[PDB]
Structure 1
């Protein structure tokens, strides 16, 4: 009941007991392993105080006042407000703790060494899609910090009944538009073409280029969402050059500095925050491997390998592999020559192993998803390839949620 994870590059072993505190199910049974399925699958007051009890107990058991009366009066206070209103509200300190631990428990995140250094923006007083748009601009500006990126989350009012829900309809706050062409093909980002249509549907005026920043579709208190365009001076973008190849400029590629996921749900003490955009900084491979070279994304390996003049008749020339390394040299180089925060997959996996140690020491475990932790290129020349990870679901936590245009009573 006190399981062991081994590292095979180092022969180092650690003991996981943190998984005893786990609660939610994983998809795996004693006779089936779902570790590579992407997404496996009102809340009453009878269930809401147990979750409120569990959260608050570890929150006072973090500030070395577990079991005190300051704890007990807080437990009694939440208990009775869960009688009165049936729901409850978190303290400022309980929200900052809960948010930082949702990140800390996010087993699919390799950059979690930074989990404590997070800036929480309490937007629970927000009421309008314009108020949402204000909070979100202030997040963008702060989290960007002139390229010296800082991580942050903005927490909008929690779900109450179920109809009245704050939702950022964008998947990330900043993404490039996606238009399918009359000739069947696709301009911009193909992942967003469904979204982009809903944007033009709500009256967006598309510039119809490659790297068009989408507007925000912000839904406030269950209301029909409204389009707002982040001021372009707030959207920091990096033009992508290669430090050897001058033809690389003519590829005319760029990316935005700020990775800010907006479509997930923040669970704290049984409360559900449907709108909780959180931002850090990019690991190089997300842009240079996935965004740029996924077949159903920008799919640029074709053209990069051309300009390198590569043996493209043969699958086995590793022409694909060769153009993939140059592209991530170009992402990295470009972001750093502009002083915009980016981390390479070597230094990020190293930090994660480093983070993983401290978690097994001063916490007794680190939930971790190998399928997601291993970078999508050069897997085994990074140290996380050789690290056995235990995946389990701790709380507070970030969760996926449905897209709102497929659930909203419109």
Structure 2
């Protein structure tokens, strides 16, 4: 019932009790582990509310108090009458920060308690959504000194009036099929780009076209808005020793902002909850730049470096990968845009894990996602056993809207 995790580099053993509070399921059974799979009424709602409020009143050291009982009563009354309830500001803020705290795939959680929460529950139209989002972008960007933020649109009602941001991240590059057979821009975004074109977007058809936002209010048809170009901070990618690197013409955006997830707090579902922090370098340099299905630049870099590309065993891919990653970090640092390297981020996460075990009795973590996509075992997280389980409040995946929406 009480589970141990061991770090194999330091011999440190921690005991997890927090997992006994887990509510959602993992995908795994006693016969099969699905650890590497990417995507595995009134009656239900009051239990979920009580569970949340119980944890909230516990957190402010007021469990079993008058105010605790009074709120449980109030929310009970409200669900009985209206079939839903509204969070107090304090509850919403606590809930958002805890969804981040519980995000088992996030290495950056040492930061969880410093999250600026923008309450957009008063929003009613797509134009309002656009206004809130520009404000979030500008606040979070802060001229390169990035601050973590989330903007929370109105909660699901009957599911026919959902707020959604159709974009997967607030800031991303277009992707286009070429008559050439190849792909121009970001190949991950071809489908969404086509939907944008279909909804009317005049596509520039370049390599780094920032996508417009496709916003849906109150379950209405989504509408198009261009983020003011002056609010989208981008960084030209250059290398501190290779003068030719800049001639590749690469750049990336400074603000990582996930917009397609669902925030569940005390049974309530917030289907539009864009959130942002700052990048870990490998996200851009390993994944964005080097994935086969992404910008896929390894061959070009290796050629300019004049590496022996004859045989895999010269490790030319590995050498080119490291240099691309050096260039990403150097370019962000030179332009003074917050970025963390994988060594510093994983060291921080180990400290955070130790804090959470000491202070909460555990930390759900998904090793498959926490370990960086390069140089795994020279980071301390590689040697750290982790237990993965689902706690609420939480961020969840949800179906892409174009499959769900009735026009």
Distance 1:222 1:305 in 2: 49
Range with bigger deviation, 264-273 or 307-316: 307-316
Q: How far is the alpha carbon of 1:117 from its aligned partner?
A: 0.2
- The unaligned stretches of length 5 or more in structure 2 are none
SS at match of 2:146: coil
Distance 1:112 1:259 in 2: 15
Distance 2:209 2:137 in 1: 17
Distance 2:294 2:403 in 1: 23
Corresponding position of 1:332: 329
RMSD: 0.4
Distance 1:60 1:337 in 2: 45
Q: How far is the alpha carbon of 1:72 from its aligned partner?
A: 0.2
SS at match of 2:300: helix
Q: How far is the alpha carbon of 1:28 from its aligned partner?
A: 0.6
Corresponding position of 2:264: 267
Q: How far is the alpha carbon of 1:344 from its aligned partner?
A: 0.1
Q: How far is the alpha carbon of 1:301 from its aligned partner?
A: 0.4
Distance 2:360 2:332 in 1: 35
CA deviation string 1:179-217 (max 9, x = no partner): 111111001000000000001111111111111100000
CA deviation string 1:37-96 (max 9, x = no partner): 0101xxx11000000000000000000001101000000000000001010000000000
Distance 2:309 2:217 in 1: 51
Distance 1:7 1:357 in 2: 11
Q: How far is the alpha carbon of 1:227 from its aligned partner?
A: 0.5
SS at match of 2:355: helix
SS at match of 1:95: helix
Alignment of 1:10-409 (within 5 A): 10-40=10-40, 44-409=41-406
Distance 1:205 1:29 in 2: 49
SS at match of 1:333: helix
Distance 2:325 2:174 in 1: 22
Q: How many aligned positions are there?
A: 407
Distance 1:330 1:202 in 2: 37
SS at match of 1:61: helix
Distance 2:205 2:306 in 1: 31
Q: How far is the alpha carbon of 1:30 from its aligned partner?
A: 1.1
CA deviation string 1:268-320 (max 9, x = no partner): 00000000000000000000000000000100001011100111111111110
Distance 2:46 2:98 in 1: 19
Distance 2:335 2:4 in 1: 43
Distance 1:365 1:194 in 2: 40
Q: How far is the alpha carbon of 1:219 from its aligned partner?
A: 0.4
SS at match of 2:5: strand
CA deviation string 1:9-54 (max 9, x = no partner): 11001100000100111011011111000101xxx11000000000
Distance 1:75 1:69 in 2: 10
Distance 1:180 1:12 in 2: 51
SS at match of 2:239: coil
Distance 2:42 2:181 in 1: 52
CA deviation string 1:309-354 (max 9, x = no partner): 1111111111101100000000000000111000000000000000
Distance 2:262 2:25 in 1: 17
- Compute the TM-score of the two structures, normalised by the length of structure 2: 1.00
Distance 1:9 1:277 in 2: 37
Distance 1:198 1:408 in 2: 13
Distance 2:267 2:353 in 1: 27
Distance 1:67 1:232 in 2: 51
Q: How far is the alpha carbon of 1:163 from its aligned partner?
A: 0.8
Distance 1:141 1:46 in 2: 41
CA deviation string 1:113-132 (max 9, x = no partner): 00000000000000000000
Distance 1:110 1:38 in 2: 17
- Compute the TM-score of the two structures, normalised by the length of structure 1: 0.99
SS at match of 2:59: coil
